[PDB]
Amino acid sequence: TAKKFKVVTTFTIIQDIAQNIAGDVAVVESITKPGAEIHDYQPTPRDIVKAQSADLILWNGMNLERWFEKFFESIKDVPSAVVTAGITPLPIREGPYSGIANPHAWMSPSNALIYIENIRKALVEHDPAHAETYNRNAQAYAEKIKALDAPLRERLSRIPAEQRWLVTSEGAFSYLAKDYGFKEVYLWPINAEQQGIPQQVRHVIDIIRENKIPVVFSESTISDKPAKQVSKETGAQYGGVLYVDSLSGEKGPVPTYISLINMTVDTIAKGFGQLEHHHHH
Ligand SMILES: [Fe+3]
């Protein structure tokens, strides 16, 4: 058989999901590389050539990729497909992007089942010669995602309802927090060049003090300094780096979509746990 069906995605979470559905019969490549900021990414000549060479382009939609529309004007005769059809959007409530959908829908495992379904449909339509391989790989991979729900829930189970505050830098965890009963606090609603972050840093400092929230987090594609400022001024621990916008590289700590969900939930649970330094009181 000749060269495989080539799929190009806008960022790495879609790439890894799509690659599991594709298995060995298609090659899935990501426009943005691990670690790169994906909201205001600036496409390069490599990105255009890679997209022009694909047989299918997958993107998130929900205004995640602010660059995609201009980028896509420069690609001729490549079909695109949004992978979030059927997602129920949560709105951004503050800032210059109030009213636009919060696009980080993949942070909910049960939304991943909708991503998988939409990717599977797109692949079967545009490469029907391998339809049965996509359908079987999509089914098998949905079962892996469904098996995550019960252990993720167990991992968070000793944080009582009123202590479940998720304090992060980007408000990128709203779909995860909704599924698992967390109240979200963020330093900015969504990545962008924007006013109001120093103000919000001080608003969040007050919320942590009033509710005795023990931990705050940052994310892997943005600067950890505002979160460290919050930790310094409140006494809350800096709980480390959460992954939402990007996987790591293939040899780093978060190589797959499932690992991103597990590491993020585990890092959250470790931030609330009492297993630090201990004395005999
Ligand atoms: Fe984001």
Curated annotation (Swiss-Prot):
The keyword Disulfide bond does not apply. Keywords: Ion transport, Iron, Iron transport, Metal-binding, Periplasm, Signal, Transport. It is found in: Periplasm. One of its GO terms (cellular component) is periplasmic space. Pfam families: ZnuA (PF01297). One of its GO terms (biological process) is iron ion transport. GO terms for molecular function: metal ion binding. SUPFAM superfamilies: Helical backbone' metal receptor. Fe(2+) binds at residues 39, 104, 170, 245. InterPro entries: AdhesinB, Bact_metal-bind_prot9, Lipoprotein_PsaA-like, ZnuA-like. The keyword RNA-binding does not apply. Part of the ATP-binding cassette (ABC) transport system YfeABC involved in iron import. Binds iron with high affinity and specificity and delivers it to the membrane permease for translocation into the cytoplasm. Also binds Mn(2+) and Zn(2+). There is a second metal binding site (site 2) involving Glu-125 and His-126 which can bind Mn(2+) or Zn(2+). It is unclear what its physiological function is but may participate in protein-protein interactions with other metal- binding proteins. Belongs to the bacterial solute-binding protein 9 family. Monomer. This is Iron-binding protein YfeA. It comes from Yersinia pestis.
